[PDB]
């Protein structure tokens, strides 16, 4: 596998979005992963609708602004036959009536693949060979809310009880040695003002820190 990967540099990743006061990170993580896979398939980067997922995936087990799971979202896109563009189904950060329109769909998936749980080396192989990967993490800390620079490492981070969905867009390392001071490149959905332009470097190969490899998955397109 490559020493570092950054899919943002290859055109696979949309600008950072903002979920605002709605517990929809699972939806941003899912559209981020589908955006990368549709780009890989077509060469076209099209922003996808998180509101489509919030309003329409309750049957699959999601709860809109009260929380959800990326695999249930990819399952919705498969059963639904499509997912609308961000432009055509705008984000309003509140639970609303499902207004899915097939004529505005710009994405599809046949299901999803799960990364072997708990294995950061399996996640590294997925990120390197597939594209951006949806992952869950423990973001329940002031150190995360006020993160700004450096490799994030929080002693109180859980690898099992995870409250947030984010997108691994790559991995890297600091310094000249590619085998230490490693990090996961993570896209958040708290706006570009949060973190480092909306991103965070999370410690990699430090025992599945904050659970990044616990519940990782990607849509099959």
């Amino acid at each position: 596998l490559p020493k570092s990967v950054d899919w943002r540099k290859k055109g696979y990743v949309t600008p950072v979005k903002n979920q605002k006061q709605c517990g929809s990170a699972w939806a941003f993580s899912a559209t981020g992963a589908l955006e990368g896979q549709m780009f890989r398939k077509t060469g076209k980067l099209v922003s996808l609708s998180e509101q489509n997922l919030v309003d329409c995936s309750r049957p699959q087990g999601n709860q809109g602004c009260n929380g959800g799971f990326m695999a249930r979202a990819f399952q919705y896109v498969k059963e639904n036959g499509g997912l609308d563009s961000e432009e055509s189904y705008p984000y309003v950060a509140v639970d609303e009536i499902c207004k899915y329109r097939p004529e505005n769909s710009v994405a599809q998936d046949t299901g999803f693949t799960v990364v072997a749980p708990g294995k950061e080396k399996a996640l590294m192989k997925a990120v390197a060979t597939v594209g951006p990967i949806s992952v869950a993490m423990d973001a329940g800390h002031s150190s995360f809310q006020f993160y700004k620079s450096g490799i994030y490492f929080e002693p109180d981070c859980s690898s099992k009880n995870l409250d947030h969905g984010v997108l691994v867009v790559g991995y890297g390392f600091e310094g000249a040695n590619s085998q230490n001071s490693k990090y996961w490149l993570v896209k958040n959905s708290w706006g570009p003002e949060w973190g480092s332009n909306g991103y965070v470097k999370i410690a990699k190969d430090k025992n599945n820190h904050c659970g990044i490899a616990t519940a990782a998955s990607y849509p099959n397109v």
């Binding site: 517990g23 929380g67 959800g68 799971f69 990326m70 869950a136 099992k160 947030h164 969905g165």
Partner: peptide, 7 residues
């Protein structure tokens, strides 16, 4: 463990 939703 707990079944937290990913808000």
């Amino acid at each position: 463990e707990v079944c937290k939703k990913k808000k």
